[PDB]
Design a binder for this molecule. Structure first.
Ligand SMILES: NS(=O)(=O)NCc1csc2ccccc12
Ligand SMILES: [Zn+2]
Length: 258
């Protein structure tokens, strides 16, 4: 009986095994655009994914992860609210059963069809495991997805999902360039938060881009063909794998733009 997104093991149940679920800096949160304040101390955001090396894609029973080789200083995120260099380790998405829902963060309560999370760990900590024991160990770049025109840079991901339909399946996935998933603008909101899935560790500096990327209905429909279950088990479509907005508590969301 482990965590998931169903009625009996979903978000409202996680606190039992992970008490920090009711913590002081949980994610995601609703981004009240009028309450967010422009911050002049933020440095320009720098996303350097030119040397990124993807290795494989995996269905972990919650979402699918595109993992990268982070043994060297390649794909890195720095600047903005970040001090130092954060290295890309993997990315995944959260999506809904319908286009009207799916994202984790919301903007003035508006839910997008999906949300992309590019996960990075602070290199000052040596590795991902050590980073998640720190208050500033991680940086997650979140990007909203809306349904409209297709996103060319996403098709390669969409086309390999058939090979990892069920929990536990993985497939080689080299030479994928994550630059093809970024919107034109890097304007963003930032705040201190947590991982949105158990263990819900509060080690994240969130950077959520204001501009969403457009993906086609056909592309997101394929996300919804994935399974939460493993091979040979009853089919439970992988949809609505998002956690709802959590209490902002003692936090301020800062904007990189005016
Ligand atoms: N949705 S999320 O990125 O906030 N958390 C998802 C996640 C990324 S790396 C990692 C490692 C262990 C458990 C969960 C996770
Ligand atoms: Zn996520």
């Amino acid at each position: 009986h482990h965590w998931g997104y169903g009625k009996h093991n979903g978000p409202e149940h996680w606190h039992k095994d992970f008490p920090i679920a009711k913590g002081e800096r949980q994610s995601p949160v609703d981004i009240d655009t009028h309450t967010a304040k422009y911050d002049p101390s933020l440095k320009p955001l720098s996303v350097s994914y030119d040397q990124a090396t993807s290795l494989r894609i995996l269905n972990n029973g919650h979402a699918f992860n595109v993992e990268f080789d982070d043994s060297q200083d390649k794909a890195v995120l720095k600047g903005g609210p970040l001090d130092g260099t954060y290295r890309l380790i993997q990315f995944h998405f959260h999506w809904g059963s319908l286009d009207g829902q799916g994202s984790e963060h919301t903007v003035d309560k508006k839910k997008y069809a999906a949300e992309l999370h590019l996960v990075h760990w602070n290199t000052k900590y040596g590795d991902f495991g050590k980073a998640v024991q720190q208050p500033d160990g991680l940086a997650v770049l979140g990007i909203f997805l809306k349904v409209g025109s297709a996103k060319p840079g996403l098709q390669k991901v969409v086309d390999v999902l058939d090979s990892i339909k069920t929990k536990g399946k993985s497939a080689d996935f080299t030479n994928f360039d994550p630059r093809g998933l970024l919107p034109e603008s890097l304007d963003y909101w930032t705040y201190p938060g947590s991982l949105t899935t158990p263990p819900l560790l509060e080690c994240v500096t969130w950077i959520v881009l204001k501009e969403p990327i457009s993906v086609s209905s056909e592309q997101v429909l394929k996300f919804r063909k994935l399974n939460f279950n493993g091979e040979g088990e009853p089919e439970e479509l992988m949809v609505d794998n998002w956690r709802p907005a959590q209490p902002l508590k003692n936090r301020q969301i800062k904007a990189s733009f005016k």
